[PDB]
Amino acid sequence: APMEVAVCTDSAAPMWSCIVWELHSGANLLTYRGGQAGPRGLALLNGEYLLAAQLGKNYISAWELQRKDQLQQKIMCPGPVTCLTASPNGLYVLAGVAESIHLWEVSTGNLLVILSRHYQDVSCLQFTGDSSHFISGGKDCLVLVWSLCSVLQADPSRIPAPRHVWSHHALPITDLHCGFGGPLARVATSSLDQTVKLWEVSSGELLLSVLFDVSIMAVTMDLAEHHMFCGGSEGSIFQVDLFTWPGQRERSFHPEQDAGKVFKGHRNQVTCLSVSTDGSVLLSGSHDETVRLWDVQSKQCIRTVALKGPVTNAAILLAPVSMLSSDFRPSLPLPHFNKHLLGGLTLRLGLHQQGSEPSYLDRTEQLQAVLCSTME
Amino acid sequence: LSSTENLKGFIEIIIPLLIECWVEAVPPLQVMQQVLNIISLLWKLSKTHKLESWLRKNYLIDFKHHFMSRFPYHLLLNLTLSDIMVSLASTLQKDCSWIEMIRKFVTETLEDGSRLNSKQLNRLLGVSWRLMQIQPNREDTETLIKAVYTLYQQRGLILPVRTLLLKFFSKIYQTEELRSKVLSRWLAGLPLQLAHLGSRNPELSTQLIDIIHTAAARANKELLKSLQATALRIYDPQEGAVVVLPADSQQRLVQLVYFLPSLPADLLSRLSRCCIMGRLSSSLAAMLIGILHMRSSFSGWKYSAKDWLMSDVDYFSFLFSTLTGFSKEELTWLQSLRGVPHVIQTQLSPVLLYLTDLDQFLHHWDVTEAVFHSLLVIPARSQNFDILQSAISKHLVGLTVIPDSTAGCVFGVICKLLDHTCVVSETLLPFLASCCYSLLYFLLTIEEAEHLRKRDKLWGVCVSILALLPRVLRLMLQSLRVNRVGPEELPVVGQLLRLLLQHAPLRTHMLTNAILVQQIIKNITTWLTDLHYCFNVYI
Secondary structure (H helix, E strand, O other): OOOEEEEEEEOOOOOOOEEEEEOOOOOEEEOOOOOOOOOOOEEEEOOOEEEEOOOOOOEEEEEEOOOOOOOOOOEEOOOOEEEEEEOOOOOOEEEEEOOEOOEEOOOOOOEEEOOOOOOOOEEEEEEOOOOOOEEEEEOOOOEEEOOOOOOOOOOOOOOOOOOEEEOOOOOOEEEOOOOOOOOOOEEOOEEOOOEEEEEEOOOOOEEEEEEOOOOOOOEEEOOOOOEEEEOOOOOOEEEEEOOOOOOOOOOOOHHHOOOOOEEOOOOOOOOOEEEOOOOOOEEEOOOOOOEEEOOOOOOOOOEEEOOOOOEEEEEEEEOOHHHHOOOOOOOOOOOOOOOOOOOOOOOOOOOOOOOOOOOHHHHHHHHHHHHHHHHO | OOOHHHHHHHHHHHHHHHHHHHHHHOOOOHHHHHHHHHHHHHHHHHOOHHHHHHHHHHHHHHHHHHOOOOOOOOOHHHHHHHHHHHHOOOOOOOOHHHHHHHHHHHHHHHHOOOOOOHHHHHHHHHHHHHHHHHOOOHHHHHHHHHHHHHHHOOOOOOHHHHHHHHHHHHHHHOOOOOOOHHHHHHHHOHHHHHHHOOOOOHHHHHHHHHHHHHHHOOOOHHHHHHHHHHHHHHOOOOOOOOOOOOOOHHHHHHHHHHHOOOOOHHHHHHHHHHHHOOOOOOHHHHHHHHHHHHOOOOOOOOOOOOOOOOOOHHHHHHHHHHHOOOOHHHHHHHHHOOOOOOEEOOOOOOOEEEOOOHHHHHHHHHOHHHHHHHHHOOOOHHHHHHHHHHHHHHHOOOOOEEEOOHHHHHHHHHHHOOOOOOOOOOOOHHHHHHHHHHHHHHHHOOOOOOOOOOOHHHHHHHHHHHHHOHHHHHHHHHOOOOOOOOHHHHHHHHHHHHHHHHOOOOOHHHHOOOHHHHHHHHHHHOOHHHHHHOOOOOO
């Protein structure tokens, strides 16, 4: 059976700063010691390094996964870092500085491009589940869909432009959720105007405009797109059913049922949501200093782990080999992350054939052929 | 000409013949102009890339020189020629000569266009838009933008022309996402126009609020200054631009409060007065409080000093003045009146209760939930409770007559913000006791057909405040003298005692003071039969 962890961070950090505890046991696995984290500012890099932003300050820390102490490498930026996100494959680390979308490369360590189209701060940054598109949104009520192909191989005198410009909200964005896929995925942007819209990343069209009662501050979706758990600004965790589908494009929550589709038990905002793999336990942070697991099938609480201070980042992962093992020295050291705009790839060969070794019957047949040829 | 080929087959047939007529025209005055008309007619009849490129590459030679007309030579003659010439991608470098002189012509007609009718003016506007689109260099478009703005600023224009110009400009602003001084100077004059246009043209005001919202979404610093300057006028309770417009355009204009740079005491007060009264719907009263909370100092974010200007004291003043929402002038006038068949009078509690219509009470009870939630999130509950107690002891205890809405809302705040560390002052208890007794008398004596639905809420609030604090119950029981109370109020006090006896939660705090229960009972004798037996309750 697999193992599921729940990474949690607090905005006060008296003793620890990123506690990793087992889901169905509640016991700690790994802790970390250092500066305070930042909202939407945690991202595991290649399953080896736990990069984290800093609250207010302008730089990014870096913890090796099997090490309780901060490393001596600090990514530095020319302005207050707002959000961070590492690409799923692990090749690119992409962060947002004020209104810029600084993009790095893990292999060489260079700073490829500095994209800049938002008119105000950038407050959410997500990567499509195949690292082909990355969606960025900010406090200017704009959600843009970039493309990792066009923004990388663009001429230095071409000023790359976003593939899609989604401008339907009337208030700052707060969270996004790009599902699996690629050029066929679906985004679930949510703003402060009490709406949660589900877009399409292939053609760029609206599909749903659920309008809630309180401002939405976090949206997560089931991996098969069956439920859309939208957080609230008062504590409730509303739930939309995408497979019932009453059959319109601009719904409203109260006509879409109530009191049987609302998780309740929180007393302040919920700026964190994540659904487990199978889709039976939901982990939600808050601002009332509590991270609690729900029971999506029965809308009941399970445990009420209480942190210190507001909860910034909280998510459910599938525990890699890193956390299970005890030493796991990283394959490659983290390079020197540049802060100025610009061959030489640094990589380990012999990984495109891992396991492509001859089978027992193949070797036996080759040996028998050699014997027969020698006999003649 | 319905088929594409039938129209195309007609194309090569006629136009060479009108060129023959074009030479015969000039080596009357209609001749050439009618030839100009039918070409555009069929060009429009086209609306494609291959066919338009075919016409371009096949008739460039003729159109360059033979199709020229008398520019100096009331202006449609040259206007149609300019339209078709512009209607003929990336060929600006090979055509800059006639592009430049056509730009000069369109600027010349734009500058002095005052008596021009709507149709050819729209055609000229489209021609100018296509001219700036085909030449996307800022320096060349600056002069055209200046000319069209000077047309926009002429001393008196008809409404359709103004609407068309505003639509074109909108379609010149709502594309920047795809900072000219002349473009941004017209933007600054939009909030003043919106403030002046109260209710005459709702559609124009909707367009204005849409463009203002779009521009403020990009922090255009030449607009936010004027918006902050006119925020006082545009947000006004009595008359303004938040309460007089329909329910649709008053949602964007309350969501716009987020982008407002600074919120001083004046704007905050006249915005609280906008949301307390019945002018604004209760649905759009939680949105405003949520926005003001998200722009407050306890949201969780930190940004520029000028914004986030909810400097604690002003935020608490706004929250209190919307919790006990009633203006000072109307409250003082209400205090002035004395003696109506609308106000409950009591000789035992020196506080009277002014009665309110059902709609006002329902609105004030549906708007106070947001205040409850906003005042519940505040960290360090003791400090905000102390601030609330100071506000109550400064603005409410000295009052003689209090409304039936505040008497419930303040009790709700007190019973919702109470915890272990909270401590109630000693100069506040008598006011609470008097208000509680007057409220109970009001609930007991309810004899129009409207003031009956506001009973369960008030009874729940009263029982909750009675249960949470026992000192107010003790004070009310102590201040239950019957010697001064006349025979008119003899049965009501007994009914109140019976009802208090019946209810279960008010038992532990009640049986402690048992002597005062009998002391009033014997004085009552000097309906009563039930009270005497009811001392021992299910025991």
